[PDB]
């Protein structure tokens, strides 16, 4: 499956200036567009190479949309202040996530249209794309508002139509980047702990997309240990990184194996240094 | 102005460390709220000039993440680290770069 997601953040800073507003567009796990009110002039700028193929009217319409949404979020911050009986001297945040995951075919798998106030869930469009789910009473006021006005219909119209079509277009244009599959380069490192045990470390570098599984099978299989495992992090060049470490007594190094399961690999890797 | 998530820091590099070969050092800071944060990259305890930052965005649970990166030429005697300041921590956390972790 593939995804087109948009992440929007409005943060207030009383005494300084107007609220800072940012928009970030993602295809799958790769950022490709950005908006920021704290720039030389606020415009929708490209962040990937394949997206620069778009014409000037593309960026013009996206900039207009971002500025409209920024005004909306300013008003929203003030009304949330009124809603929660909060002082005008504090810094508050308003996050918004909207997007579509479609299957390999093209049918819409899932639509997202959710908001959060101060890092807490506010209101979210359900899976039916018709009804809303609110957290507290202010969000219930917002929900009854949006149900009178019927905003769910317009939001579902975006999620089922515009979003899917533009995701198909983005995949088609950036074929060379988005749908590539890079195999992980993996290796095992060794460290002597201050005691008699040693730390074995299984790496996986330079893979794309980020979906990978790193596991440690012992003499046979199973985990059965507090294996260390960091989250998949980005190397900053389009590829990703992961590693899993384990402790092992001095001598059993030849009895431990690492398994790398990645979609860009014909056969999962079995490893041991 | 509500909850507090303490940032998580990872310092690493793209390509495996090779002495004399220039590379990119990354500071990956995830799972923090509020989004106001300060990240500095230090070489031998001194601040590195040109430090570039990925655009701030959040994850499914509304926790913000960000990626700082700079050019660096790793040697065997140079020390690299990442210092973070955030409203959830009493003091600026420093995570040193381990060429094996």
């Amino acid at each position, epitope marked *: 499956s593939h995804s087109l997601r948009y992440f929007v953040t409005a943060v207030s800073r009383p005494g300084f200036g107007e609220p800072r507003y940012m928009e970030v567009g993602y295809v799958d796990n790769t950022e490709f567009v950005r908006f920021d009110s704290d720039a030389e002039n606020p415009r929708y700028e490209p962040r990937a190479r394949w997206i620069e193929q778009e014409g000037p009217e593309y960026w013009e319409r996206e900039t207009r949309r971002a500025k409209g949404n920024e005004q909306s979020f300013r008003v929203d911050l003030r009304t949330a202040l009124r809603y929660y009986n909060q002082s005008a001297g*504090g810094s508050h945040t308003l996050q918004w996530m909207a997007g579509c995951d479609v299957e390999s075919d093209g049918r819409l798998l899932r639509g997202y249209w959710q908001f959060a106030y101060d890092g807490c869930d506010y209101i979210a469009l359900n899976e039916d794309l018709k009804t809303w789910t609110a957290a507290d009473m202010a969000a219930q006021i917002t929900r009854r508002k949006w149900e009178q006005a019927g905003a769910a219909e317009r939001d579902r119209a975006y999620l089922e139509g515009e979003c899917v079509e533009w995701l198909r277009r983005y995949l088609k244009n950036g074929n060379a980047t988005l749908l590539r599959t890079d195999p992980p380069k993996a290796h095992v490192t060794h460290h002597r702990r201050p005691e008699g045990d040693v730390t074995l470390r299984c790496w996986a570098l330079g893979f794309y997309p980020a979906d990978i599984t790193l596991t440690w099978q012992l003499n046979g299989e199973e985990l059965t240990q507090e294996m260390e495992l960091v989250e998949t992090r980005p190397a900053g060049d389009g590829t990703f990184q992961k590693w899993a470490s384990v402790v092992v007594p001095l001598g059993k190094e030849q009895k431990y194996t690492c398994h790398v399961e990645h979609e860009g690999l014909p056969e999962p890797l079995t490893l041991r240094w | 102005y509500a909850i507090q998530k303490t940032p998580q820091i990872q310092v690493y590099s793209r390509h495996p460390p090779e002495n004399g070969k220039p590379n990119i050092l990354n500071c990956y800071v995830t799972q923090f709220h509020p989004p*106001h944060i*300060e990240i500095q990259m230090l070489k031998n305890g*001194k601040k590195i000039p040109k430090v570039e930052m990925s655009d701030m965005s959040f994850s499914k649970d509304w926790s913000f993440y960000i990626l700082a990166h700079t050019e660096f030429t790793p040697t065997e005697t140079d020390t690299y680290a990442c210092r973070v*300041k955030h*409203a*959830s921590m*009493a*003091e600026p956390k420093t995570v040193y770069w381990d060429r094996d972790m």
Partner: antibody
Amino acid sequence: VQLQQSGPVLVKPGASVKMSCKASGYTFTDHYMNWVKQSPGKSLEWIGGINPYNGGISYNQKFKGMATLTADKSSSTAYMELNSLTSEDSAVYYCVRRIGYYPSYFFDYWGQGTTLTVSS
Amino acid sequence: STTVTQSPASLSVATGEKVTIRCITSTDIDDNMNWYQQKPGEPPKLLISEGNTLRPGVPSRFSSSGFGTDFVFTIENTLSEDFADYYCLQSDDMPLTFGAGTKLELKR
């Protein structure tokens, strides 16, 4: 908006004392709480701080072992406890609020201060 | 501890001229330097926060400058109510350290 400290205290040497600091006019957990000493002449030294959100504590090495910082979220009150008190501890003690949200450590609001006298 | 030296310890100026207070640090603190004013009897009041940010409500005659190790606090055309004690405080790393202060008195 308001930080009300306890009244002046007089204790004997080698004893302990607990000062309070009642906060009002803001969400208590959204700000750190520091304590600062001011001596007759040589003035203004940071003792330590606490986070009422998770109890996270920072201390000055000069006063490590002497100061115990706690905070109660229900009554939105900070407490500092001094022990093994000498004459060089007689001073004015302020609870000060640390700026919130931004990644900074300066203080913005100061309590009225409590005068502590250690004398036999 | 990073030491913080404030100069001068005392100053004598009339009503309406410039007051310049220097504050040096022992390490690099970037611009994380803050300026507090304290009138007799009262607790200190924050005047200028990190960087050179003038706090809300503070009159525009107060200003700060400097960066790294050297910092300056300037009052242009001091009023009669500007005469008090002034302290500088770095907020770069722990422990937070204050200056020795400046006893600014009215030269009448």
